[PDB]
Swiss-Prot record, chain B:
Function: Attaches the virion to the cell membrane by interacting with host receptor, initiating the infection.
Organism encoding this protein: Human coronavirus HKU1 (isolate N2)
Residues with attached carbohydrate: 8
Annotated protein name in UniProt: Spike protein S1
Swiss-Prot record, chain C:
Glycosylation sites: 22, 39, 43
Role according to the record: Attaches the virion to the cell membrane by interacting with host receptor, initiating the infection.
Source superkingdom: Viruses
Name of the protein in its database record: Spike protein S1
Disulfide bonds: 2-34
Length: 50, 50, 50, 49
């Protein structure tokens, strides 16, 4: 579960700071939405397994 | 790896390596007095993909 | 790494005892445009280099 | 202009301010993050690393 925070999931980076430093606030939300969806999916799968 | 240090472990790394079990290609040439033309052809002018 | 005026039949000359021909892989004595320039060192007595 | 190497760097802050003990933001040679630094003696860095 800790290694899920190093997947890109379709975004250009796995880092929330390399997106906010290198993209405009319109263009950053498209990548932050993909990271949010990938990490929420990982948490749902873990919660069902428990 | 570029400027990274790894210590007492194994690493699974995707990179740019030779294929294990492939052969080489001697392209060195030693002239003495003359300068050919068939030396300068797509036999010796080669490709660069990766 | 520069844009050079490349010869048709390029070749070199050993800088220990000179040969019949001259080292001429370009004729560009006007300092052309360059992307990169550097100098590195290696062991003079080592046999194999990769 | 606008093609070559003689650049007017204008770098953020290559400050000699490695402050140990507290949380900082870092941009170390391209890698970004946050963390607490703590000085040590280490004998495994070659000159390319
Ligand atoms: C890299 O090294 C080469 C060879 O040591 C340098 O070329 C010499 O440059 C000086 C000054 O321009 C000339 O007087 C010599 O005749 C050159 N030697 C040869 C063999 O060409 C070169 O300048 C160095 N490059 C850098 C960026 O320092
Ligand atoms: C302007 O450029 C100078 C170039 O000298 C910068 O000062 C250098 O900073 C580095 C980083 O520690 C040192 O290694 C150099 O020794 C410094 N130069 C000197 C002459 O001491 C400076 O930081 C730059 N400032 C701005 C505002 O761009
Ligand atoms: C070798 O690597 C293992 C990896 O877990 C580590 O536990 C061990 O301490 C290492 N050996 C030394 C001498 O540091
Ligand atoms: C090599 O260059 C020198 C000086 O320009 C010249 O005298 C000599 O004839 C050249 N060699 C050949 C084979 O042309
Ligand atoms: C490498 O260089 C060192 C010093 O420059 C020398 O002592 C050593 O013999 C060299 N080894 C080879 C294989 O060239």
């Amino acid at each position: 579960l800790l290694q899920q925070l190093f997947n890109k999931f379709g975004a250009i980076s796995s880092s929330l700071q390399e997106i906010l430093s290198r993209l405009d606030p319109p263009e950053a939300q498209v990548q932050i939405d993909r990271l949010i969806n990938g990490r929420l999916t990982a948490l749902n799968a873990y919660v069902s397994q428990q | 790896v570029l400027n990274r240090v790894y210590l007492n472990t194994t690493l699974l790394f995707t990179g740019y390596f030779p294929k294990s079990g492939a052969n080489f290609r001697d392209l060195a040439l030693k002239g003495s007095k003359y300068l050919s033309t068939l030396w300068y052809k797509p036999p010796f002018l080669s490709d660069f993909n990766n | 790494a520069c844009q050079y005026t490349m010869c048709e039949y390029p070749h070199t000359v050993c800088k220990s005892k000179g040969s019949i021909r001259n080292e001429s892989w370009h004729i560009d004595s006007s300092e052309p445009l360059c992307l990169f320039k550097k100098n590195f060192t290696y062991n003079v007595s080592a046999d194999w280099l990769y | 202009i606008n093609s070559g190497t003689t650049c007017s760097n204008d770098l953020l802050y290559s400050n000699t301010e490695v402050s140990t003990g507290v949380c900082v933001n870092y941009d170390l040679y391209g890698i970004t993050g946050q963390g607490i630094f703590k000085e040590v003696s280490a004998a495994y860095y070659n000159n390319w690393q």
